[PDB]
Design an enzyme around this catalytic site. Structure first.
Site, PDB file in Angstrom:
ATOM      1  N   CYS A  61     -78.373 -33.997  25.204  1.00 34.17           N
ATOM      2  CA  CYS A  61     -78.989 -35.303  25.461  1.00 34.17           C
ATOM      3  C   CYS A  61     -78.435 -36.020  26.694  1.00 34.17           C
ATOM      4  CB  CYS A  61     -78.862 -36.205  24.218  1.00 34.17           C
ATOM      5  SG  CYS A  61     -78.434 -35.377  22.654  1.00 34.17           S
ATOM      6  N   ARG A 107     -69.324 -25.905  20.034  1.00 31.79           N
ATOM      7  CA  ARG A 107     -68.521 -26.836  19.261  1.00 31.79           C
ATOM      8  C   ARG A 107     -67.314 -26.094  18.714  1.00 31.79           C
ATOM      9  NH1 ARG A 107     -73.748 -30.020  16.448  1.00 31.79           N
ATOM     10  NH2 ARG A 107     -74.475 -30.755  18.497  1.00 31.79           N
ATOM     11  N   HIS A 155     -86.190 -33.761  24.363  1.00 31.45           N
ATOM     12  CA  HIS A 155     -86.185 -35.217  24.310  1.00 31.45           C
ATOM     13  C   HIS A 155     -87.476 -35.748  24.886  1.00 31.45           C
ATOM     14  CE1 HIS A 155     -81.993 -34.049  24.134  1.00 31.45           C
ATOM     15  NE2 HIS A 155     -81.854 -35.114  23.366  1.00 31.45           N
ATOM     16  N   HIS A 181     -85.145 -37.699  20.073  1.00 29.72           N
ATOM     17  CA  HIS A 181     -84.564 -36.370  19.939  1.00 29.72           C
ATOM     18  C   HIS A 181     -85.397 -35.602  18.928  1.00 29.72           C
ATOM     19  CE1 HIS A 181     -80.562 -38.226  21.279  1.00 29.72           C
ATOM     20  NE2 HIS A 181     -81.246 -39.259  20.827  1.00 29.72           N
TER      21      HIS A 181
END
Ligand SMILES: [Ca+2]
Ligand SMILES: [Zn+2]
Ligand SMILES: [Zn+2]
Lengths: 400, 400
Positions: free
Chosen positions: A95, A124, A146, A272
């Site tokens: 984003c 992550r 988005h 989103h």
């Protein structure tokens, strides 16, 4: 036996190496074909539905996430490193960089909505003890996108987003429940923003005619959301698909557009959204969903050519070659094994079709087409009839 | 005539030297070009029996100690700790592919194995040395590793030369060939280097082309054929390489069972190779090469539909949609501008074709096709004729 870890081995799709890269996946040729087909399915719809794919960086100066407001919360689970004595990191989401792109594009209202899609690799830092196959990973790609739109466009964009989900999930054979989550106590943005957006969300949901449950006060701090729980054929539920409105990033990145802070300029709303979720996880669900019996347009192993005897091998190979040249995922078994042994062996890797090539087929310049589902009677086709049939089984399309 | 300027004027890509210097933001049209360049190669992979795979991006640095990249490459690697253990972002694919080969555990009957990988690679270049897409920190290579028997070296190197000759010819490049030999520091014995350099020399001699010795620039794991291409601006670019590697097979203990270090096993040979070099660099070269006038099959802007008047906008939109549904990269200008102004505006973005649509065209169910090169006379064609023309200008094929 339907666990995706077992199927990834049995079907030679992927493996993990817990010593050199625990939490990331090694996708073997067959697994990578499935992975890319899942993404290309989504891309085919993106073209139909006016989403524009972009490509964004993977590593950034941590200033980006100090700007976006994700740094304090995400740093602990990000992979972070210094670059010329500045703190950088690997992206755990797309984003913020899409906000940078919106800023660069600097559009007016006449060009909204803008729909930036990004399959970028995300990372992550999941604890090693939590890692589990494709369901808990350190490395994943999302069918992330988005939508940047005016407040007045929320309803129609959310309705189209719901239609998009319904199409994909129905083609994958899922059912699903819908949940609308509304303004929590602590919330960013004005009440009028939330009321206007919640009404548009409610309005879109109603217009689908499908049942949906309200979860009052369970929205995000930065916007209301629709959550989609899907159900596989094992009657298990998975939260893959999301529609999340965002009033925060427009402000934090100082996004603006000239209408039909600054005067005469409004802020866009950010939606989103994702349908597959992570390609890694959707792959696992689908494999367990189908037990590895993938539909032709997802399958890494579409048709295998089986020669009944050595005399027909050269003709049988010419068939496999043309099918390969036409873009289908094929192979061949030209061993001296009996034809029945060859069929049984090919059931193991879930080929969608078995092409039986004997003297009768080479004489009449035809092929014997057998289906993995043995209740479907065999067909005797010319190569051109075979190619036409296979071509009609590409991605299901929302305009077809 | 500079790719960075072209990327801005053609709204292809941009750089944010504050949040991610050395990486690139590809706007919608730029990402279309990026993917088409990869799609071109991928089509040849299918014709030439390369299998794409997907590997991690981050690894324990044990992998590069195993591979031997670690000493000389860590200075230019992005490195970070994971649960108190040193990891890094991959700057090349080779080691991961060795891990996969070992997992695959093939027999001689499965050789050669050709693993292709477009994964994202990262190298930490000094910020003061970064330069658009030419010198970067982030890039995707058209990388592939061929694992073959010693006896297969000549035929696989021959095919790799043939692959490279085909691609460069279709892109309009000439090129010079170099044999880069034993660098100062290297793995393996001088005898192994002798065998490897003479195998590459022999391949080079069979081509009948001129080539030059390049002492000192071989990789630490083996010699390589290096290819310098020349563009239309008479500037040279190193993009292509074919590298012969007896050393990583030893580092990783790669073995395969034979027809007749273990008994009955032999080590495979690795042939490293790339043709584009990186999608990033090759995109920049092709842009400069053509001044932004891309061939139809690479262009992200293939045809724009221009309505002469409000009356023909609805019909002109139907033409746009059908072309989009058929896979072509199209848009439309349905504004109030005069047709002459629409044509001038669209020329700025180097559309390959403009479809002029008036009430005459609407009435007869035709389009007026104007070429970017206005020395080519305009045509009046049906939609089916147009689509036949467009379909005949797809990816050049080595079997077409
Ligand atoms: Ca593609
Ligand atoms: Zn997002
Ligand atoms: Zn390599």
């Amino acid at each position: 036996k339907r666990d995706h870890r077992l199927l990834g081995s049995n079907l030679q799709l992927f493996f993990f190496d817990s010593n050199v890269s625990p939490g990331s996946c090694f996708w073997l040729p067959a697994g990578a074909r499935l992975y890319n087909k899942l993404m290309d399915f989504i891309r085919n719809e993106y073209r139909i539905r006016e989403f524009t794919e972009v490509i964004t960086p993977n590593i950034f100066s941590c200033d980006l996430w100090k700007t976006s407001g994700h740094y304090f919360a995400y740093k602990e689970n990000m992979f972070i490193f210094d670059v010329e004595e500045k703190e950088w990191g690997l992206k755990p989401m797309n984003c913020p960089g899409h906000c940078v792109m919106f800023k660069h594009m600097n559009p007016s209202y006449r060009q909204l909505p803008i729909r930036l899609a990004d399959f970028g690799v995300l990372h992550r830092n999941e604890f090693s003890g939590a890692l589990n196959g494709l369901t808990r990973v350190r490395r994943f790609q999302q069918d992330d996108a988005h939508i940047f739109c005016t407040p007045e466009q929320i309803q129609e964009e959310v309705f189209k987003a719901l239609d998009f989900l319904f199409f994909i999930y129905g083609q994958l054979g899922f059912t699903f429940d819908l949940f609308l989550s509304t303004m929590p106590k602590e919330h960013l943005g004005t009440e009028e923003q939330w009321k206007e957006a919640e009404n548009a969300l409610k309005s879109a949901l109603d217009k689908t005619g499908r049942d949906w449950k309200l979860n009052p006060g369970d929205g995000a701090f930065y916007g209301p959301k629709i959550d989609i729980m899907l159900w596989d054929a094992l009657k298990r539920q998975h939260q893959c698909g999301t529609i999340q409105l965002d009033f925060q990033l427009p402000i934090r990145f100082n996004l603006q557009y000239r209408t039909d802070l600054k005067q005469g300029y409004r802020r866009p709303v950010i939606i989103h959204r994702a349908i597959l979720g992570s390609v890694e996880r959707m792959s696992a669900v689908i494999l367990e969903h189908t037990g590895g019996k993938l539909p032709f347009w997802l399958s890494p192993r579409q048709a295998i050519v089986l020669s009944i005897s050595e005399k027909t091998v050269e003709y049988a190979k010419s068939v496999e070659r043309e099918l390969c040249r036409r873009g289908f995922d094929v192979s061949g078994d030209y061993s001296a094994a009996t034809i029945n042994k060859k069929i049984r062996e090919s059931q193991l890797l879930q080929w969608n079709y078995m092409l039986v090539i004997g003297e009768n087929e080479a004489r009449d310049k035809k092929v014997t087409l057998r289906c993995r589902d043995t209740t479907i009677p065999q067909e005797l086709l010319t190569l051109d009839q075979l190619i036409l049939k296979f071509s009609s089984m590409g991605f299901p399309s929302s305009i077809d």
